[PDB]
Amino acid sequence: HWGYGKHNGPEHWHKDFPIAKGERQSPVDIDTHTAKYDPSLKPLSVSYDQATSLRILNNGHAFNVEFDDSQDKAVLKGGPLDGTYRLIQFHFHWGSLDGQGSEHTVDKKKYAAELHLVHWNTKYGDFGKAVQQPDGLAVLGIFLKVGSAKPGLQKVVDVLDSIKTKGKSADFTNFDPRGLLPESLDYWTYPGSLTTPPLLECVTWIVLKEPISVSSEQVLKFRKLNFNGEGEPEELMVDNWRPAQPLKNRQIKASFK
Ligand SMILES: CN1CCN(NC(=S)Nc2ccc(S(N)(=O)=O)cc2)CC1
Ligand SMILES: [Zn+2]
């Protein structure tokens, strides 16, 4: 099965998932000088006040904080989007070292980690239908740099000891994802894909310009997770990022000058 190792990592994915070499793959390098301001782009509308978190799961590739998406409780609208996109889960990608871990890069710069808040277009009725559509998902991506702690992240950090290995989950109610956002909602946007298999080309990417800062201790705790299941040989969950893919026939648009 696919993963992030030498023998099953991103260079191998195309054999099971030929769309890996497709026309709108993610992530990409964001060349800030070549991105163009699009004055028609609207401000993002992030409406997370009624978000209902449920559970946190180690799925063997990352950990997901899952939400109740059976009603419009936490939604993303505006920006490049037409319609309403419901928050289903968030997760991170991170490195073994503070100088790598993000999936997107900015002028070739890698951040220590990247947060993905995953939303699906409610006109398609369920997430499984949405991933089959070119405008099915909107993923809000937020860079993490190492510096001061992010207080809104600490509850996530605190529970990781309970989901160390693949397949473990824990209750994770009453978590407020607003505590993970930076001050500014300025963003870049482009059409892309899931960054893991099955690599479906269903995502409108919205990547925030402003990173959040997390502490060295917070990211160290991410790095104590395991890719393996309990009772299997220990493999630290680190470097679970796909590198930047060719931009091909795409333009990245900026919401800001
Ligand atoms: C077919 N089916 C599609 C649903 N997939 N589930 C999820 S949560 N996939 C998923 C993968 C990568 C991202 S990312 N890193 O692009 O945000 C976001 C979501 C399971 C398999
Ligand atoms: Zn992701």
Q: Which residues is 143 bridged to in the sheet?
A: 114
Is 93 annotated as ligand-binding?
yes
As a whole number of angstroms, the distance between CA 86 and CA 76 comes to 6
Give the whole-angstrom CA distance, residue 89 versus residue 115: 11
Q: Which of 30, 70, 18 is nearest to 190 (CA)?
A: 30
Are 53 and 128 in contact by the 8 Å Cβ rule? The answer is: no
Pairing state of beta strands 29-30 and 105-106? parallel
195 labelled ligand-binding? yes
β-bridge partners, 253 = 36, 189
Distances (CA, A) of 186 to 45, 92, 183: 11, 20, 9
**Does a cis peptide bond (omega within 30 degrees of 0) precede residue 10?**
no
With tokens 């782009």, the residue in question is 41
Q: Residue 37: beta bridge partners?
A: 254
Q: For this experimental structure, what is the resolution in angstroms?
A: 1.2
Question: Which of the 8 DSSP states describes residue 13?
Answer: G
Expressed in angstroms and rounded, the spacing between residue 91 Cα and the centre of ligand 2 is 6
Residue pair 192/27 in contact (Cβ under 8 Å)? The answer is yes
Measured between alpha carbons, how far is residue 39 from residues 116, 139, 187, 254 in Å?
A: 25, 21, 12, 9
Catalytic annotation present for 61: yes
Find all residues with CB under 8 Å of 223, minimum gap 6, and list them.
Answer: 94, 96, 236, 237, 238
| Helix (H) or strand (E) segment spanning residue 130 | helix 127-130
Q: What tokens appear for 221 in the block? A: 């705790």
3-state class (DSSP) for residue 243: coil
Q: What structural domains does the chain harbor?
A: 1-257 (3.10.200.10)
Exposure string over 196-235, b if 16+ CB within 10 A, otherwise e: bbebbbbbbbbbbbebbbbbeebbebbbebbbbeeeeeeb
Q: Ligand 1 test: best mutation among 196, 241, 242, most atoms within 8 Å of CB? A: 196
Report the phi/psi class of residue 89: left, alpha or beta, with left for phi > 0 and alpha for psi in -120 to 50. beta
Residue burial 86-107, b: 16+ Cβ < 10 Å; e: rest: bbbbbbbbbbeebebbbbbbbe
Report the length, in residues, of the chain.
257
Q: How many C-beta neighbours within 10 Å does residue 187 have?
A: 23
Neighbours of 81 (CB within 10 A): 19
Name the residue at shortest CA distance from atom 19 of ligand 1: 194
Ligand 1 binding pocket, CB closer than 6 Å: 89, 116, 118, 131, 139, 194-196, 198
Which of 56, 47, 51, 61 lies closest to 103, judged by CA? 61
Q: Which of 220, 1, 229, 195 is nearest to 94 (CA)?
A: 220
- Tell me how far apart the alpha carbons of residues 55 and 57 are, in angstroms, rounded to a whole number: 7
Q: Known binder of ligand: residue 91? A: yes
53 vs 51: CA distance, rounded Å: 6
Residue nearest to atom 13 of ligand 1 (CA): 194
Reading the block at residue 98, the tokens are 């503070």
Here the tokens at position 52 are: 């209902």
* Phi, psi values for residue 162, rounded to 5°: -90, -10
Nearest partner of 92 among 101, 83, 79, 82, judged by Cα: 101
